[PDB]
Amino acid sequence: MDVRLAFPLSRAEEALPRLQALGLGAEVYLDPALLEEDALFQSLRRRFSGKLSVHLPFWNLDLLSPDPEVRGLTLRRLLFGLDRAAELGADRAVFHSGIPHGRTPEEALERALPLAEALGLVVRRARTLGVRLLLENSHEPHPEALRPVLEAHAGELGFCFDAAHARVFSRTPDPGPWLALAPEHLHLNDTDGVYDRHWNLGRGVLGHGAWLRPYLDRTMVLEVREDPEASLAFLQALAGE
Numbered sequence: 001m002d003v004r005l006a007f008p009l010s011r012a013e014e015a016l017p018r019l020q021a022l023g024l025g026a027e028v029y030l031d032p033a034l035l036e037e038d039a040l041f042q043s044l045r046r047r048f049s050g051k052l053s054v055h056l057p058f059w060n061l062d063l064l065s066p067d068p069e070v071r072g073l074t075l076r077r078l079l080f081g082l083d084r085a086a087e088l089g090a091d092r093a094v095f096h097s098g099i100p101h102g103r104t105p106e107e108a109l110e111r112a113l114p115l116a117e118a119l120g121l122v123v124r125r126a127r128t129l130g131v132r133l134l135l136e137n138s139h140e141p142h143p144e145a146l147r148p149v150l151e152a153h154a155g156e157l158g159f160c161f162d163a164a165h166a167r168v169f170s171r172t173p174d175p176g177p178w179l180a181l182a183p184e185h186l187h188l189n190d191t192d193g194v195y196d197r198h199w200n201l202g203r204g205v206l207g208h209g210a211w212l213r214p215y216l217d218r219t220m221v222l223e224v225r226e227d228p229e230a231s232l233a234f235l236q237a238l239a240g241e
C-alpha cells in the first residue's frame, strides 16, 4: 500500500523521523509564508527519499474570487507551489476548488466551467513539470459540481476524495456519489460528523470498513493531527481480510 503522512513544510523536522519509523510516504503542505525559503526545500529533498506529493496552498484562495487581487494571488500561489512540487520530485499536487462554504447546488454548478477555464494555466504548468494535478472536494454540496471540471479537462485533472469534508461540509454525506468520480488519491481521517477533526481512522463516524477496502491499491494520505499509527494499523487490518 502507498500510505503517506500529511504534514506542513513548517513541521517537516518534526514529522520526518515518524515517517521513517512507520515506513510512510509524504504529502507536504506548502506553507505560503515559506514558499520563498530555498534552503527548506533543499533540506527536505536531501533528508527524504520515498514517495512524495504536495498539498498546494489553499487558505483564502479562489481562482474565481470576486476580488481581482485574490484571483491574481491564487494563480501565483498555485503556479509557484507547482514549481516547488517539481523541485521536491512530487508525483502529485492537490488543491481545492476555492468554493466558499454554503453555496447552493446551482451556485456550485455554475462555477464548474469557469473554474475549468481558470485552471488552464495551472493544468498546463503541471503538465510541463510532470506533476499530476488533483482537485480535492472541500465545500461543494454535491459531486456533480466537480464532475464537469474533470470532464472539461478530459483526463488531465484527477480527483482526491476527502470523506470527512463530504460529511461535515457538503449536502451529500454518503461517500458513494463522491466515489463515483473515481478518486485516484484519498485523504483519510475520521470525524465526529460535526467538525473536520482529522482524527485517526476508527475514531469517528465515517465507517471506513464499509467502503474503503476497494481503494487500498490507491495512494492514501493520512490527514491526521495525532500520531498516525492507529490509522496505519486500521488500514493493515482492512487489507488482511
Ligand SMILES: [Zn+2]
Binding pocket: 055, 094, 096, 136
Ligand atoms: Zn485539502
Ligand SMILES: [Zn+2]
Binding pocket: 136, 162, 165, 187, 223
Ligand atoms: Zn483533505
Ligand SMILES: [Zn+2]
Binding pocket: 162, 164, 165, 196, 198, 223
Ligand atoms: Zn480536512
